[PDB]
Design a protein around this nucleic acid. Structure first.
Ligand SMILES: C[C@H](Cn1cnc2c(N)ncnc21)OCP(=O)(O)OP(=O)(O)OP(=O)(O)O
Ligand SMILES: [Mg+2]
Ligand SMILES: [Mg+2]
Lengths: 414, 554
DNA sequence: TGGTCGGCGCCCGAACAGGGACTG
DNA sequence: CAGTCCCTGTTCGGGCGCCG
């Protein structure tokens, strides 16, 4: 109902974002432009000049099966420069209830955010520069007056007036757990979709004529969770065919300290010929099925500390197969999974890796209200080139690019 | 005159003052000019005279303009700049002749004393203070300050550019079907109207600018195709770069090589197959740009080679938004590559090279990807889209390289182009042990304090060997050992290793490396008819492992 | 006499940065 | 454990080209 604007300070000892806008398709410029004009014609934004030293990249994303577009800005650089605002001062508890909750639903409503003026003394930071094809006309700048989507403060403030809008439901439906991240809103329940889905259609009319508007939908990440560390089953065991399962079970030890080697390690000590079939022991063969018994027993030491950063490494296992390991510390993965190519999809590395990076994160949030810093297995330039092409998440997780081959045939392979 | 356009708010760097440096003596030529200019400005009000109350001063001079005969006043605002706030440059890149689309009517027109027409913020004016010295240097110099953007002030550009747009906005807004490639103050005005309606409209633009304080003097190419634009010549149906003279000499210096390679680089956009790997390699020895470097045969060719390509006159065509966008690449040799973009067989839109040696261990396919990449990019910066490719690599060479590579890699809609030299892998390591193959057990160590080391192996045939090492590393060793196990092995082998370093290097299927050793390692792997390579956790009692490590030890 | 500024391209060097193997 | 080394990347800045 728009009166009050909350002062926001940039975490002292710092400065603002100054990230260059990168190349965009002609479908995207004609996009942002048709957007950024309406957005100004209704004062959410205002042109600005070169006397403003700040910039944050932007772009569009045609929504899945949705013909209409949707602007988007890589504020990752700002949010990291305004955390104490929405961290220390305006923290967040632990909505564990949605984790176990049968069926959840993501509902984006950041669209509301625009009906709330933004601290003027701040706006100068929401600056983004639209570009031009072949560089005809110089960059067209802008700035925010309201609350910019994708900003972390944006929700952090609206958080109040939100809760309120939600009481005519939250209390009259305590069962259904409701969460809010960035621009998205989560509706975790424990009923059937024959209802849960219809219950969302109710939370719609509630939020609709209350002021807000909302544009395999549902989720139940628990009905998946971590995965095994599966071992090979043979009737014969060559020199290497063993020297392998040995090396693997060597690293698999740092994660599980309860695995044994000796019995399966003594099966040979001479410069034997790699292919010499040698199934060779009573206790060693017993040991195998033992170390095999540990890979059924979910590890120990995993303590989720919300006061540190979640990482995530991934693997390319051919045929739409991608394996990951959500973890905060070395060898203590608070979660690990595998992603398989969706039905009908084609074979495209990035197109996939992204989708992966997303689901991985979608989960991550509904499981820690945070996002993990992916350590991608692709080439910067390659990533940086097409990714944007395939994204769809109103947010954007941190990320780095790394290169390291699979020598222990990945504890996770298949 | 000066335009009404509102000025742009500019502060100094928090807690800082203005310039305060004097004026170095100038020839009696410059001064003779700097005055004749100022008189004109002052009278026009482009700068007011200042007195004692202005405690500031920065140095000036004049450089001659293109055509010459006229002078350009410039102020050494170096200091002021450092002392001024920051600005968000708004000139993202550069337009490309190959980006212009066909138009029925084109004209161009620079703007008179551009900078000196846009109002400069009331307050800031203080600092822009400067002084015009005299001849005999006896009588004090005349002291002034600017009212309009000074030439050479850290912000002028962004402000002029920003300003202009706003100024053109109304006109553009009311005549959408007219395009205007604005570059700083130079204006490219095309449209698809007849000489009538067009020249009619052109005038409107012109008065509008003048109305807003902008001058379009007769230095506006009308029915002057070839229009001169950005360093090119715009013909009705094709364009080109302007004269691109190279420096013809005997005693070469680092500077020269630099102005050479650079000049060639400018060409590389239209004259196909230029190359510089060799010439610019001649600039690895960081030294004085005055220091005489020795031209090498190796490169002596590269010069004269390219020097020939430039003899042939060449041109490019423009863009048609209807026909598709093709890009085809070829391998010029040493990791270099040359591509040309187009839509019509021998109607090249643009041409480009690519010689970035990324990494220390790569292959042709690796590079041939980072090419597609570089191309994809600019092709969007120019046409706002992604070109279909024509790749000298087999639909299968690739099919293999990715389904088998650990990392993710992608390449847009492409199609094979049979035309050597074609691209391809030179050896695919066995994914299984080769039966009846002297399974080797390699390793090698080195003492980091004496820089000495040993490298060797063993086999399922007991066959034993080892070699001493100089300055080697804990790394150079493992390799050095894998190096021999090859020459000491026939067509089919089977080496086993503990070291990841070398395993990974190999699995990359490199065929290019600055690493001497790695070369042979590859070359050898190419001669062999099959090779399997496995890994085993080093320093943990393991068959065959022990002995090898055991053997080589210090 | 050679001295300014903003954009982008290219080459190169240097300063970082992060793992893995060692040592102490 | 640390304190190292190797080796691999990234970044940033310098010089030149071209444009205004
Ligand atoms: C000066 C400005 C761009 N420019 C061109 N050269 C410089 C330079 N050395 N420093 C700063 N700016 C520069 O305008 C382009 P230019 O057209 O070259 O000069 P002008 O001010 O427009 O005056 P005229 O039309 O009579 O030639
Ligand atoms: Mg001009
Ligand atoms: Mg070793």
């Amino acid at each position: 109902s728009p009166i009050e604007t909350v002062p926001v300070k940039l975490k002292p000892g710092m400065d603002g974002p100054k990230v260059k806008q990168w190349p965009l398709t002609e479908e995207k410029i004609k996009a942002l432009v048709e957007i950024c004009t309406e957005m100004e014609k209704e004062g959410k934004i205002s042109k600005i000049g070169p006397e403003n030293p700040y910039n944050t990249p932007v772009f569009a994303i045609k929504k899945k099966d949705s013909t209409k577009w949707r602007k988007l800005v890589d504020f990752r650089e700002l949010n990291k420069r305004t955390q104490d605002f929405w961290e220390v001062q305006l923290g967040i508890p632990h909505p564990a209830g949605l984790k176990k909750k049968k069926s959840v639903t993501v509902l984006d409503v950041g669209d509301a955010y625009f009906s709330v003026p933004l601290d003027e003394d701040f706006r100068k930071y929401t600056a983004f520069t639209i570009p031009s094809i072949n560089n005809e006309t110089p960059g067209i700048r802008y700035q925010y007056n309201v609350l910019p989507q994708g900003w972390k403060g944006s929700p952090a403030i609206f958080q109040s007036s939100m809760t309120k809008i939600l009481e005519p439901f939250r209390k009259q439906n305590p069962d259904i757990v409701i969460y809010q991240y960035m621009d998205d809103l989560y509706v975790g329940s424990d009923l059937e979709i024959g209802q849960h889905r219809t219950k969302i259609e109710e939370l719609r009319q509630h939020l609709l004529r209350w002021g807000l508007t909302t544009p395999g939908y549902e989720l139940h990440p628990d009905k998946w969770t971590v995965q095994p560390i599966v071992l090979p089953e043979k009737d014969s065991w060559t020199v290497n065919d063993i020297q392998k399962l040995v090396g693997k079970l060597n690293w698999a030890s740092q994660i599980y300290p309860g695995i044994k080697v000796r019995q399966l390690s003594k099966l040979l000590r001479g410069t034997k010929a790699l292919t010499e079939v040698i199934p060779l022991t009573e206790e060693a063969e017993l040991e195998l099925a033992e170390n095999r018994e540990i890979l059924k027993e979910p590890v120990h030491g995993v303590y989720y500390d919300p006061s540190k950063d979640l990482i995530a490494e991934i693997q390319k296992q051919g045929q739409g197969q991608w394996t990951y390991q959500i973890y905060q510390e070395p060898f203590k993965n608070l979660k690990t999974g595998k992603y398989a190519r969706m039905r009908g999809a084609h074979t495209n590395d990035v197109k996939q890796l992204t989708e992966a990076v997303q689901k991985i994160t979608t989960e991550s949030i509904v499981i820690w209200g945070k996002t993990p810093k992916f350590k991608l297995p692709i080439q910067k330039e390659t990533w940086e080139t097409w990714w944007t092409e395939y994204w769809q998440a109103t947010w954007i997780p941190e990320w780095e690019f790394v290169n390291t081959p699979p020598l222990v045939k990945l504890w996770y392979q298949l | 005159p000066i335009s009404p356009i509102e000025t742009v708010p500019v502060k100094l760097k928090p807690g800082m003052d203005g310039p305060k440096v004097k004026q170095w003596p100038l020839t009696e030529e410059k001064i003779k000019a700097l005055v004749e200019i100022c008189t004109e400005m002052e009278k026009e009000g482009k700068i007011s005279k200042i007195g004692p109350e202005n405690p500031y001063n920065t140095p000036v001079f004049a450089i001659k303009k293109k055509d010459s005969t006229k002078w350009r006043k410039l102020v050494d605002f170096r200091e002021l700049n450092k002392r001024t706030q920051d600005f968000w440059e708004v000139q993202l890149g550069i337009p490309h002749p190959a980006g212009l689309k066909k138009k029925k009517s084109v004209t161009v027109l620079d703007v008179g004393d551009a900078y000196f027409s846009v109002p400069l913020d009331e307050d800031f004016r203080k600092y822009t203070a400067f002084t015009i010295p005299s001849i005999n240097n006896e009588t004090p110099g005349i002291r002034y300050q600017y009212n309009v953007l000074p030439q050479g002030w850290k912000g002028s550009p962004a402000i002029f550019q920003s300003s202009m747009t706003k100024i053109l906005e109304p006109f553009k807004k009311q005549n959408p079907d007219i395009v205007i490639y604005q570059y700083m103050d130079d204006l490219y005005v095309g449209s698809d109207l007849e000489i009538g309606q067009h020249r009619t409209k052109i005038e409107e633009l012109r008065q509008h600018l003048l109305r807003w304080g902008l001058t379009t003097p007769d230095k506006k190419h009308q029915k002057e195709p070839p229009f001169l634009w950005m360093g090119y010549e715009l013909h009705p149906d094709k364009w080109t770069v302007q004269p691109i003279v190279l420096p013809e000499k005997d005693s070469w210096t680092v500077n020269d090589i630099c102005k050479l390679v650079g000049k060639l680089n400018w060409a590389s956009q239209i004259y196909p197959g230029i190359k510089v790997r060799q010439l610019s390699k001649l600039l690895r020895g960081t030294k004085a740009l005055t220091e005489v470097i020795p031209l090498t045969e190796e490169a002596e060719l590269e010069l004269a080679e390219n020097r020939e390509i430039l003899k042939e006159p060449v041109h490019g065509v423009y863009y048609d938004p209807s026909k598709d966008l093709i890009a085809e690449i070829q391998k010029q040799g040493q990791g270099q590559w040359t591509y040309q973009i187009y839509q019509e067989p021998f109607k090249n839109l643009k041409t480009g090279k690519y010689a970035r040696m990324r990494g220390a261990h790569t292959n042709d396919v690796k590079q041939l990807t980072e090419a597609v990449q570089k191309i994809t990019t600019e092709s969007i910066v120019i046409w706002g889209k992604t070109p279909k490719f024509k790749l000298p690599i087999q639909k299968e060479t690739w099919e293999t390289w990715w389904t088998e590579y650990w990392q993710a890699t992608w390449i847009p809609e492409w199609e094979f182009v049979n035309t050597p030299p074609l691209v391809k892998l030179w050896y695919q390591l066995e994914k299984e042990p080769i039966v009846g193959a002297e399974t080797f057990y390699v390793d090698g160590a080195a003492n980091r304090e004496t820089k000495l080391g040993k490298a060797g192996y063993v086999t399922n045939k007991g066959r034993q060997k080892v070699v001493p090492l100089t300055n080697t590393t804990n790394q150079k060793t493992e390799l050095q050992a894998i190096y021999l196990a090859l020459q000491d092995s026939g067509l089919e082998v089977n080496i086993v290793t503990d070291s990841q370093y070398a395993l990974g290097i190999i699995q990359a299927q490199p065929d290019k490396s600055e690493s001497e050793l790695v070369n042979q390692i590859i070359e050898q792997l190419i001669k062999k008819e099959k090779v399997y390579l496995a890994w085993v956790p080093a320093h943990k009692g393991i068959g065959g492992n022990e002995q090898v490590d055991k053997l080589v030890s210090a």
